[PDB]
Amino acid sequence: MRLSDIETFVVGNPPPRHGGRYFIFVKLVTACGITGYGEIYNATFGPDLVAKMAEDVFARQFAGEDPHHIEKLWHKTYGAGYTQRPDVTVMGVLSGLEMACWDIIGKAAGKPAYELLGGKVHERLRSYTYLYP
Amino acid sequence: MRLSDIETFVVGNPPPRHGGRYFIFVKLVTACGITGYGEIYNATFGPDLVAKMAEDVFARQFAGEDPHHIEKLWHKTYGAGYTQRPDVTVMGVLSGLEMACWDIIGKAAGKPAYELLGGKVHERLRSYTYLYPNVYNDADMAAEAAAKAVDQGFTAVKFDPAGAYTIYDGHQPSLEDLERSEAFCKQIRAAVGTKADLLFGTHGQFTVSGAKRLARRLEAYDPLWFEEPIPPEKPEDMAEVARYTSIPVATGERLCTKYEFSRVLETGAASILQMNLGRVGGLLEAKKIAAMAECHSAQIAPHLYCGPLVALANIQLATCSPNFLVLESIGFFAELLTTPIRWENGYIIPSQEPGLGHDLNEDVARANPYT
Amino acid sequence: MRLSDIETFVVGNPPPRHGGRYFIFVKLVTACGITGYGEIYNATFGPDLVAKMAEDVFARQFAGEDPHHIEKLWHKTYGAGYTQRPDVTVMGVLSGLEMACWDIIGKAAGKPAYELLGGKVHERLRSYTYLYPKPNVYNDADMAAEAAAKAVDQGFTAVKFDPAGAYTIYDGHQPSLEDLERSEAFCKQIRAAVGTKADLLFGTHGQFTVSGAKRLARRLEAYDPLWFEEPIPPEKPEDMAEVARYTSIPVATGERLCTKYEFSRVLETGAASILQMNLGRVGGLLEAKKIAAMAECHSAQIAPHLYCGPLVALANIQLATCSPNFLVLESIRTFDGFFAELLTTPIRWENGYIIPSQEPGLGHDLNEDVARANPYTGSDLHLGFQETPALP
Amino acid sequence: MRLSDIETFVVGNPPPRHGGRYFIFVKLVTACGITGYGEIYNATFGPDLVAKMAEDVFARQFAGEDPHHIEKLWHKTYGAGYTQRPDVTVMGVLSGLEMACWDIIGKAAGKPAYELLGGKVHERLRSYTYLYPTKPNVYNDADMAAEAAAKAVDQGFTAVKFDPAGAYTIYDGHQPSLEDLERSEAFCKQIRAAVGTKADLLFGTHGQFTVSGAKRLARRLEAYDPLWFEEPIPPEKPEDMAEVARYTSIPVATGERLCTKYEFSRVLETGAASILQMNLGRVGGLLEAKKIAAMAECHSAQIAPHLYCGPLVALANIQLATCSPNFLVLESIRTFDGFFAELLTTPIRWENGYIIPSQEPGLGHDLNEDVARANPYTGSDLHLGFQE
Amino acid sequence: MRLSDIETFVVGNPPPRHGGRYFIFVKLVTACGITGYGEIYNATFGPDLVAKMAEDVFARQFAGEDPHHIEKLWHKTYGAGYTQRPDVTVMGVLSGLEMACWDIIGKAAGKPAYELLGGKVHERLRSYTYLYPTPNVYNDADMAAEAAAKAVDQGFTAVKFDPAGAYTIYDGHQPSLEDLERSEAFCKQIRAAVGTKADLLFGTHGQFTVSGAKRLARRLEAYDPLWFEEPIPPEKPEDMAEVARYTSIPVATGERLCTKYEFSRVLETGAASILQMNLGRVGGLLEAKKIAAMAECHSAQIAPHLYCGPLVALANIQLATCSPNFLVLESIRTFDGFFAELLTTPIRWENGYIIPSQEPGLGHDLNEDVARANPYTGSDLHLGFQE
Amino acid sequence: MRLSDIETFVVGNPPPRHGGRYFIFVKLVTACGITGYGEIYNATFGPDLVAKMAEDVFARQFAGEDPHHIEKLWHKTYGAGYTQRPDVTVMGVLSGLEMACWDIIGKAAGKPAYELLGGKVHERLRSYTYLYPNVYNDADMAAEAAAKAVDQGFTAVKFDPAGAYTIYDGHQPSLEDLERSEAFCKQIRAAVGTKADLLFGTHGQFTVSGAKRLARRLEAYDPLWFEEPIPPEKPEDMAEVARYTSIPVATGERLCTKYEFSRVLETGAASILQMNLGRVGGLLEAKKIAAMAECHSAQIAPHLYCGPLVALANIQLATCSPNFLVLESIGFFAELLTTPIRWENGYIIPSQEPGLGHDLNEDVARANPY
Numbered sequence A: 001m002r003l004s005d006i007e008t009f010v011v012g013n014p015p016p017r018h019g020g021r022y023f024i025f026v027k028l029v030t031a032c033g034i035t036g037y038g039e040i041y042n043a044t045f046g047p048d049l050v051a052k053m054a055e056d057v058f059a060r061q062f063a064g065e066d067p068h069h070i071e072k073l074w075h076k077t078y079g080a081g082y083t084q085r086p087d088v089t090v091m092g093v094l095s096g097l098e099m100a101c102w103d104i105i106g107k108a109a110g111k112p113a114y115e116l117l118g119g120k121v122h123e124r125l126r127s128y129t130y131l132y133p
Numbered sequence B: 001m002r003l004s005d006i007e008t009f010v011v012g013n014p015p016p017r018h019g020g021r022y023f024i025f026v027k028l029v030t031a032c033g034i035t036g037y038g039e040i041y042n043a044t045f046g047p048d049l050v051a052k053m054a055e056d057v058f059a060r061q062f063a064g065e066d067p068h069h070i071e072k073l074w075h076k077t078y079g080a081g082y083t084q085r086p087d088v089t090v091m092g093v094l095s096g097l098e099m100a101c102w103d104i105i106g107k108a109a110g111k112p113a114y115e116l117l118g119g120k121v122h123e124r125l126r127s128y129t130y131l132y133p134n135v136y137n138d139a140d141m142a143a144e145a146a147a148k149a150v151d152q153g154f155t156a157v158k159f160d161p162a163g164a165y166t167i168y169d170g171h172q173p174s175l176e177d178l179e180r181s182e183a184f185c186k187q188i189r190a191a192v193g194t195k196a197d198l199l200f201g202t203h204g205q206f207t208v209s210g211a212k213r214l215a216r217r218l219e220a221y222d223p224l225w226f227e228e229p230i231p232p233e234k235p236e237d238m239a240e241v242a243r244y245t246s247i248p249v250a251t252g253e254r255l256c257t258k259y260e261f262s263r264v265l266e267t268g269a270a271s272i273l274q275m276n277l278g279r280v281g282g283l284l285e286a287k288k289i290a291a292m293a294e295c296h297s298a299q300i301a302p303h304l305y306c307g308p309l310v311a312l313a314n315i316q317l318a319t320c321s322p323n324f325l326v327l328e329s330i331g332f333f334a335e336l337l338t339t340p341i342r343w344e345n346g347y348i349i350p351s352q353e354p355g356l357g358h359d360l361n362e363d364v365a366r367a368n369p370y371t
Numbered sequence C: 001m002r003l004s005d006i007e008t009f010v011v012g013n014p015p016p017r018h019g020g021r022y023f024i025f026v027k028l029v030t031a032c033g034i035t036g037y038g039e040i041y042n043a044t045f046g047p048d049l050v051a052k053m054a055e056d057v058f059a060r061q062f063a064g065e066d067p068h069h070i071e072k073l074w075h076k077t078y079g080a081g082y083t084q085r086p087d088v089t090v091m092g093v094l095s096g097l098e099m100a101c102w103d104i105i106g107k108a109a110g111k112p113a114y115e116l117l118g119g120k121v122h123e124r125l126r127s128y129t130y131l132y133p134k135p136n137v138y139n140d141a142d143m144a145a146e147a148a149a150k151a152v153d154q155g156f157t158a159v160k161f162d163p164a165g166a167y168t169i170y171d172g173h174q175p176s177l178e179d180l181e182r183s184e185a186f187c188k189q190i191r192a193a194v195g196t197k198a199d200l201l202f203g204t205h206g207q208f209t210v211s212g213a214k215r216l217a218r219r220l221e222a223y224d225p226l227w228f229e230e231p232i233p234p235e236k237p238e239d240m241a242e243v244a245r246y247t248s249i250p251v252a253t254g255e256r257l258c259t260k261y262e263f264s265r266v267l268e269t270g271a272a273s274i275l276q277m278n279l280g281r282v283g284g285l286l287e288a289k290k291i292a293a294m295a296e297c298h299s300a301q302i303a304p305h306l307y308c309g310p311l312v313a314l315a316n317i318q319l320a321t322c323s324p325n326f327l328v329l330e331s332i333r334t335f336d337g338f339f340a341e342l343l344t345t346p347i348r349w350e351n352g353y354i355i356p357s358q359e360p361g362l363g364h365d366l367n368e369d370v371a372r373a374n375p376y377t378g379s380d381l382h383l384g385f386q387e388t389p390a391l392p
Numbered sequence D: 001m002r003l004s005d006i007e008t009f010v011v012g013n014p015p016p017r018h019g020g021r022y023f024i025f026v027k028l029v030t031a032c033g034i035t036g037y038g039e040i041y042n043a044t045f046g047p048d049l050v051a052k053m054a055e056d057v058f059a060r061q062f063a064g065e066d067p068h069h070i071e072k073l074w075h076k077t078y079g080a081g082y083t084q085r086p087d088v089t090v091m092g093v094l095s096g097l098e099m100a101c102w103d104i105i106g107k108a109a110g111k112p113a114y115e116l117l118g119g120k121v122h123e124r125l126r127s128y129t130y131l132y133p134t135k136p137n138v139y140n141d142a143d144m145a146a147e148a149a150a151k152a153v154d155q156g157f158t159a160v161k162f163d164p165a166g167a168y169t170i171y172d173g174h175q176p177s178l179e180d181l182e183r184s185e186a187f188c189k190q191i192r193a194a195v196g197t198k199a200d201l202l203f204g205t206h207g208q209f210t211v212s213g214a215k216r217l218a219r220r221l222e223a224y225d226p227l228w229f230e231e232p233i234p235p236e237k238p239e240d241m242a243e244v245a246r247y248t249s250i251p252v253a254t255g256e257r258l259c260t261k262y263e264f265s266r267v268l269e270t271g272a273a274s275i276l277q278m279n280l281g282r283v284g285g286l287l288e289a290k291k292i293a294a295m296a297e298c299h300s301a302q303i304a305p306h307l308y309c310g311p312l313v314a315l316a317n318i319q320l321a322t323c324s325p326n327f328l329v330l331e332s333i334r335t336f337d338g339f340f341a342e343l344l345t346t347p348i349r350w351e352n353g354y355i356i357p358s359q360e361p362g363l364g365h366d367l368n369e370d371v372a373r374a375n376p377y378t379g380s381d382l383h384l385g386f387q388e
Numbered sequence E: 001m002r003l004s005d006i007e008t009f010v011v012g013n014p015p016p017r018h019g020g021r022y023f024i025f026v027k028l029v030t031a032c033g034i035t036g037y038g039e040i041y042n043a044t045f046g047p048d049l050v051a052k053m054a055e056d057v058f059a060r061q062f063a064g065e066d067p068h069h070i071e072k073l074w075h076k077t078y079g080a081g082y083t084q085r086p087d088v089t090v091m092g093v094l095s096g097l098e099m100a101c102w103d104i105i106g107k108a109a110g111k112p113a114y115e116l117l118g119g120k121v122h123e124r125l126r127s128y129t130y131l132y133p134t135p136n137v138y139n140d141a142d143m144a145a146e147a148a149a150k151a152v153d154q155g156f157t158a159v160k161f162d163p164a165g166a167y168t169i170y171d172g173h174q175p176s177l178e179d180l181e182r183s184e185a186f187c188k189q190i191r192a193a194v195g196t197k198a199d200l201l202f203g204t205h206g207q208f209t210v211s212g213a214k215r216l217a218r219r220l221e222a223y224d225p226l227w228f229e230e231p232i233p234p235e236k237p238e239d240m241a242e243v244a245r246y247t248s249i250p251v252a253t254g255e256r257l258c259t260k261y262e263f264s265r266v267l268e269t270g271a272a273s274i275l276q277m278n279l280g281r282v283g284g285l286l287e288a289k290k291i292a293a294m295a296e297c298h299s300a301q302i303a304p305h306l307y308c309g310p311l312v313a314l315a316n317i318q319l320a321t322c323s324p325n326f327l328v329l330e331s332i333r334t335f336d337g338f339f340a341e342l343l344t345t346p347i348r349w350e351n352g353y354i355i356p357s358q359e360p361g362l363g364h365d366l367n368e369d370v371a372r373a374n375p376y377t378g379s380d381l382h383l384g385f386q387e
Numbered sequence F: 001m002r003l004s005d006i007e008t009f010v011v012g013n014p015p016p017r018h019g020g021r022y023f024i025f026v027k028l029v030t031a032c033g034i035t036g037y038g039e040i041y042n043a044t045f046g047p048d049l050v051a052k053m054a055e056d057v058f059a060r061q062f063a064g065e066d067p068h069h070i071e072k073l074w075h076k077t078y079g080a081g082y083t084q085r086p087d088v089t090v091m092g093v094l095s096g097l098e099m100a101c102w103d104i105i106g107k108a109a110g111k112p113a114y115e116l117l118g119g120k121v122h123e124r125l126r127s128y129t130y131l132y133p134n135v136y137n138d139a140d141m142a143a144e145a146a147a148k149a150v151d152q153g154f155t156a157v158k159f160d161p162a163g164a165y166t167i168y169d170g171h172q173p174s175l176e177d178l179e180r181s182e183a184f185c186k187q188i189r190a191a192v193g194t195k196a197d198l199l200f201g202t203h204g205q206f207t208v209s210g211a212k213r214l215a216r217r218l219e220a221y222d223p224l225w226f227e228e229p230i231p232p233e234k235p236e237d238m239a240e241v242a243r244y245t246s247i248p249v250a251t252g253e254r255l256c257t258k259y260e261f262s263r264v265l266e267t268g269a270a271s272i273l274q275m276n277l278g279r280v281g282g283l284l285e286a287k288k289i290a291a292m293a294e295c296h297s298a299q300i301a302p303h304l305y306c307g308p309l310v311a312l313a314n315i316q317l318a319t320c321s322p323n324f325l326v327l328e329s330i331g332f333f334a335e336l337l338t339t340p341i342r343w344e345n346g347y348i349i350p351s352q353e354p355g356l357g358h359d360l361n362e363d364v365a366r367a368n369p370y
């Protein structure tokens, strides 16, 4: 199994705009067709560009690889350019693609991601909100 | 999906009994038929009792649960009886049940467990072996066996010339212990040169100072590690030895759960963690422990002194671990597995088959009851 | 002198089942006839199995040995199978057998154990009880307060309660605001009921994380609780020490601990100033003694733990009696009911104090017949967590 | 005074490619006409994207501002997007734009930037170079490296740097092999024989090892009095690096992968290192590097600016070093000949092992924009790389 | 059962005076008759006075009490005069009485005292001696080596020596270069002469500062001494730990310490890995057992100190016997001569090891007759310093 | 110049017996006549043996020596018999002899001892006293005894209401102990306002946790200190109490030598040091400790529960110490001395007679054996 294609989405958030001004989505695909979604949380630059950075990372580090090899993928990215240090710009991009890899891993095993990382512990998730008008 | 039945196997190791005297296997099977295997590490009691202890834990915490639910399963067990604190007895039973769940989870995805816990990183695993007027007391005889090992492809050897370990450790090295130890290191180093690392494998014989006396005389030979220099209770004390010497300290074969390894890492007690997966808490717990070591400039080296099923679990963790240093290796291990663990020119080659990659030969285990 | 024979007893506890579901007793017999009794405190495994463990250990380690040789027996057991690290499953079995050797040692010497481990220090041992009897004593502050005045009237000078909400397999967790309301309500009403006449013991079960434990401690301080028991889980004493440093409430812990090594860390990190060894678990009488001397070096006291049978109570009493730094002894009500029937002569409770036996060894003998006549028939473990996450 | 225009050059680096694969330059222009030059040191993303990033930042934070307003500009950029924590990607771009403001600031004052930030201290700056060539070669044969250092000494260099400790992987830290140990000592031993007390040995590892890996190696180099053990372990936990630093007598030197005063504050405080190696095209800018050097004076540490990129970062490094009392040594890519000269309007002054600081205003030299435009980068790789 | 009467004996040590100038014994007697024996280790005042302090203490806290009530006895005594702080004068006297109570407790139990404090652990106790004579053994490495060679031949597996120069009242000081020279030659020569047959116990008396001790330890590590004893003075363990962290040689201290409170700090700071209690000073047998138990929690071993009479020796032996972390026991030669004459049955020394008596209590009895026939006629104190 | 003879007065303290049951005095005489007086603070043994101990010490270390040689004499006594470690039995006997030397040194040089150790710094020494007659158990009756002491001029009063101190301490305070403790502070602060500081004078009763509990309920009455909240063996432990409360911790009546006080200062155990110069090690050793205290934001407040002569030395220290806070005070005291100790409105005034400023009347001392 191997990663073939990526597609980015810059999506603007409509009124009342709770949650920021825009979201940045990615969509990874395997040669055999399986589809994975993910979001990048990065605002150190403009979104059109951060979307470009995503496609950069995917071309260098992700395409051709097995989306299960999370450790290899994460380390090729973390270390690329001889860096290997917490960087929010990179990590925000890594996080999006990595998510999608999980989406894919899951989709192929026919299981929720959480069933592969320790299993359900909660049948419900306690939630909180900001105060809004 | 739910777990239905368990079956235990106490199997006796025939001569030369390299690995123990008996192995304790388990077999979990789901309602709809998928079968996982696993090994328990317990020397604190006796095989038939340890097996019953396995059934007891299976019944109270595992029967009727989804094997995917590792966290729930582990916590049900860890807190049973209002305990919730590290305990090798429990943790060695929980370890063998948890592996079998991984074997199941893997089988239900068509994937090796390592592809679900981070993915392959290593296509081959560096292996080491013990050396086998002999090879445990004469340093000249050790170097010969060391040279043989090197000739077979091994790139690391382990030896414990440090002296008898007693039930009243930690003690002080004898002058004879010191001289024999350095001679082992010196004679072997001359035999293998740069082709194999020296793994110095004490068994917690010493007190902190005793260990330091010994480390002093060993630094010149650039040993890859000083294994378990002192007893396991105060990692704080162990860290005193790590700090003194240039030799990396390794420890972990007598520990279990994230909590104790957490402390080893934070005190700087050891830089090479030696989990035994038949005891540490399982495959997931071990992964958590190896990530933790990643934040501490520390690596893992899965300890093995038991049956093949722990070896498989060791292989699974190692294959997907970026801070893997070396794997302990070792015949009868072949015969117990449906397919043999693959070994070539010093390295273990990870199976691509689902779960733990191999299967226990139930027929052979039932044919070798321990006596 | 050599230990020859062991019998084990698994005894179900009848209604109202205070002190838990079952007790595990051991009977050690020397070749010449001297009989020791002991209790195993452990629930990692069904009581049938622990009993078989006690048996396996006694055959492997004790048979043929001079029970005077505590150090040897202990080390032989602790280091068996190359482990030599604090494991409660083993150490509980070990604690049982070790008690019963002290019973024999004292029987042979014609002295109470406590006259062999430093000598009597107390003529009476200060005592305390949980508050015992849809709203009730465990959930409604006022009913607990009434429960407490009663205890004070019986002459108890200390009562313990855990109003702090359920303990779960996923602990530590965070107190709910309800958990906080109730807790301080229990403290406020109980203190008003008992004034200076008795200390409040806040008997938590490791519920909280360090932060959650500080949130609660902040609210309880005004009522001068004598301690905060096990505010967080047992694995990291370093973390407990952060709670202890924060509050004026003394922190108390140990019921889930074993060996001198673990209590060494508690003491040195400053995780607690009150140690609560259970002698059915901590490693036996000599180890408890060793641990209680360590606490002297660290401005710390002992308050032996008890939620099991009368033989653990006996060992507790032995230790407490020869311990300069003893603070209080936990009792199951006034040691009446099934706790007296199991003994040949009962634990003496008078006006808030245990009065130590002056008889040899542990001071009392197991009524073996009463013990055999009461098998354990349930399937559950002695004690257990809530297996859903903490509310919400 | 206000900033108006920015231009970016992604310049590819002609053979022998010493100093990496490409350089990313920036030209800033004020309204009244003053030009400022600077370089960005970053390879998290391809250079074309980085350049586009630099224009994103200039347009968002710099356009319309007075370039004398470094603190304002620095903090606006530092906090763009509610981040405000080190991030080489951003910090690199910021370093380049900020350098160039100092060009403009100095040119306006008619002074070298160094005469503004505490003023000249050194009339010459001690330099060092990597041992380069022109499969037994200079990176794996101690003898061949000893000849290289011999040649380097005969030019006046008083220090040579080398890395024999094996490859550095994406899964570091790890453990040096016995061959890594044996080769490393040979290099030190041989090189020391060939240079005597004439030149210092700079052990220039690239984060390979774990703490204990580091120590095993350190124990075997101590005897050749190496001047520094560079980045013995990775950059994430300086509390761990400080363990190497305490065990050995060799001074630990690091920082080529760090940025902002915050990350060097920790290095100094923990005792992680005693020689700080900022690359001024990454650290956060010239004023930042000044603040950082001033901290090192409080912790018995010294500065020794890192360089493995274009000549503009070099100018910035030289600007700092000239005004720094706790300066130790300066990296040079060879004798600053070749494309390091061709890219400038007047080349960098290198005489007998020392760099002589220009007295021309700002960064001291101007970029030759035409040589910059006539040398695009055709490739598709990143400046520096790892093993896998 | 109650303590009734006390007798003190001040006993002069006849030549070659190995192990000091005088001994101070105590004899406790219960109402019904049982007789306990004991020794006090204290040279802060002349022995005749230490004797008097023994009766003052016996009369206020001891008389009429059950000898089983050790915690009570000890804490009544410790807390006297509103003090409750370590004090070697008080704790000296307390040790002897306490010892003697164990003798009584044991005799009444029909048991050796170690069988009441954890039980036998060793069938035999490794011992060591100072190098004694027969330009001398104290100041020349060659003669020291010869001595050590004869000690090995007798069965000894460890010898102690202090070649680091005089200890003064102004300690700590710095070693002279000759101090370092002689110190090293001692280790080299003795090591050449015993080989791996015996451990070197380098036994300084608190001579150096922490910097001083490191200067010296750096020169001794190569010969693998088993310990470096009391390298600096006893008032700041926090400082001795500085020495113990620096060198590979184990640091041992304790002969000048008393109560668990002081050893707690030693263990916790890392000042030592080998605790050297003297049971005539440390605060008694039960206190020492508590101390050895603490040391267990800290990778420390015990190695009981002896520079006095056979009775401290007997308690030392009792402790050692039931102590799983026992390293080695100080002997005075082979416990021949007066050390034998002063006991009903002598201490059993056999091929380098002491074999514990199986008789109740301390396992032997003082020869009251011999003890009375040997009073101390002199004017000096047991040990002393330089000025 | 050399020391020759020693005489030792065991003296019984008459009713109301404020300050003990007995005092132990010493008299040192030189070759050419000069005489020093001093006092030993020892209670671990009967005063009969203590005097014999002093004689023993004088013969071995002091006789035939120059009393100027404090350092020499001190280290001789301290190292006697190969000990060289803090021991209050020896240190007490030493503190008395050394005191007397400073009486002889000063007199010989015609100056008070405090003019030899950094010179005068205070003309008046802020005093305080215990609350004497009930008064030890009833809040309101102590509040009375306080307001009476204010009328006499005292600026500080001390009281121990925290319950009995046993041989098994440290313990936990009882709820009644806490209740009476707080009640004592509330009521007294009410009777004296800003005019008098509160000295909470505990006797090492509690464990660290026990002391924290009590501290919490006294903070609000701004006590000037919290004396010896736990026992003295582990200053490290004390430091927890000191760090938790705003009330200063005071300690040291049971300590000796620079070594133990050093550790008190470095660990942060106490900010107020309470040397008893009949125990601490002598006057020269006391001054060194005071100086150490300057380096850690710490002050001195000399301890006195014994005879006038210890007190005399206490004054010599206080008069020449910049970091002096307050001095303990108390009849038969002025009777044992030639010239009485001058007291004026909560303040002692130091003598300017050479040495200890005063002389023991030997006739009165002999006339009252114990």
Ligand SMILES: [Mg+2]
Residues within 6 Å of the ligand: B201, B202, B203, B227, B228, B253
């Ligand atoms: Mg091993």
Ligand SMILES: [Mg+2]
Residues within 6 Å of the ligand: C203, C204, C229, C255
């Ligand atoms: Mg409880």
Ligand SMILES: [Mg+2]
Residues within 6 Å of the ligand: D204, D230, D256, D306
């Ligand atoms: Mg570099």
Ligand SMILES: [Mg+2]
Residues within 6 Å of the ligand: E203, E204, E205, E229, E255
């Ligand atoms: Mg000695």
Ligand SMILES: [Mg+2]
Residues within 6 Å of the ligand: F201, F202, F253
């Ligand atoms: Mg007082």
